[PDB]
Homo-oligomer: A and B are copies of this chain.
Amino acid sequence: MFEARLVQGSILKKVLEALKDLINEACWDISSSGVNLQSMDSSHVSLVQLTLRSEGFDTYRCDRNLAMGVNLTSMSKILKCAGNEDIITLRAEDNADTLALVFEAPNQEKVSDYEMKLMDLDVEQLGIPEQEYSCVVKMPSGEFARICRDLSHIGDAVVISCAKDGVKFSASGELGNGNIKLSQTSNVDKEEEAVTIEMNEPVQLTFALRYLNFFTKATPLSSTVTLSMSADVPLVVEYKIADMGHLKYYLAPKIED
């Protein structure tokens, strides 16, 4: 009977909010080492890889490898009942008919127990590799979210061009044209608002802004976001959980016109 304890319950709500819009149902490949999730977009364009390591949980135990599939919308609705300070515990019996979610008040005498009916998914795994990218941009997640939201007003696709000085986001549309030049931060005592870029070569790629807007839903999880991208490879948008794991989004670039 798998059971995982999580004092910081807001993390699970934030993860499910970051996943409910891009992914409709996903298979939680829950194992002893932790919780791992992978799912293609319905249009087979974007890919998301969620990792929650068991060391990050407050109390983790998974007897065998569990591969139960859940409705991310239903799971998000249930987790909406959990407060940000509630302790969340996930339980699955020896037969994964139902996943049990237990929300406990932080210092009160309120205990919420929820069970969610699962579903069967014939989903195959994906061979995402470990790769070093010709350009890696580390910027605050709020800035990336604001840039994506702003450029979604201009056009439906964004051109991410990278140079030593900074990263340039250019969009063109019906109401005109727009580009945001984001030079590398010179010297700030806090890296939480720092724009750090390490490339090996200039790279220019075009990405659909709908999927970037979906990705930016994870901004409450991590203050800073890492955008890894090289020539002819998908953009990898990475959000670091508080040492618990990561949330990585893979987006296929648009074909240049």
The interface of chain A, by Cβ under 8 A from chain B, is: 71, 74, 77-78, 80-81, 98, 109-117, 143, 150-151, 153-154, 166, 174-186, 195
A126 CB to closest chain B CB (Å) equals 30
Q: Is B166 within 8 A of A113, CB to CB?
A: no
Q: Is A115 within 8 A of B181, CB to CB?
A: no
11 further interface pairs, Cβ-Cβ under 8 Å (given A78-B175, A110-B143, A115-B177): A81-B180, A98-B177, A109-B182, A109-B184, A112-B179, A113-B180, A114-B178, A115-B176, A115-B178, A116-B177, A117-B176
Set B109, B184, B195: member contacting A183, Cβ < 8 A: B109
Set B81, B110, B153: member contacting A178, Cβ < 8 A: B81
Q: Is B175 within 8 A of A77, CB to CB?
A: yes
Asked, given contacts A81-B150, A81-B153, A153-B78, whether A176 binds B98 with beta carbons under 8 Å apart, the answer is yes
Asked, given contacts A78-B175, A81-B153, A175-B78, whether A182 binds B110 with beta carbons under 8 Å apart, the answer is yes
Set B78, B116, B151, B180: member contacting A111, Cβ < 8 A: B180
Complex Cα–Cα for A174 and B116 (A): 9
Chain B residues contacting A78 (CB-CB under 8 Å) are 153-154, 175-176, 178
- Closest residue of chain B to A114 (Cβ to Cβ) is B178
Complex Cα–Cα for A185 and B71 (A): 35
Complex Cα–Cα for A117 and B110 (A): 47
Q: Is A178 within 8 A of B113, CB to CB?
A: yes
Among A114, A181, A186, chain B packs the most CB atoms within 10 A around the CB of A114
Chain B residues contacting A116 (CB-CB under 8 Å) are 175-177
Among A116, A178, A183, chain B packs the most CB atoms within 10 A around the CB of A178
Among A110, A153, A179, A186, chain B packs the most CB atoms within 10 A around the CB of A110
Set B113, B117, B150: member contacting A179, Cβ < 8 A: B113
A90 CB to closest chain B CB (Å) equals 13
Chain B residues contacting A114 (CB-CB under 8 Å) are 154, 176-179
Complex Cα–Cα for A154 and B98 (A): 14
* 19 pairs, CB–CB < 8 Å, chain A vs chain B: A74-B175, A74-B176, A77-B153, A78-B153, A80-B153, A81-B150, A81-B153, A81-B180, A109-B183, A109-B185, A110-B181, A111-B183, A112-B178, A112-B179, A112-B181, A114-B154, A114-B176, A115-B177, A116-B177
Asked, given contacts A78-B178, A178-B81, whether A186 binds B109 with beta carbons under 8 Å apart, the answer is yes
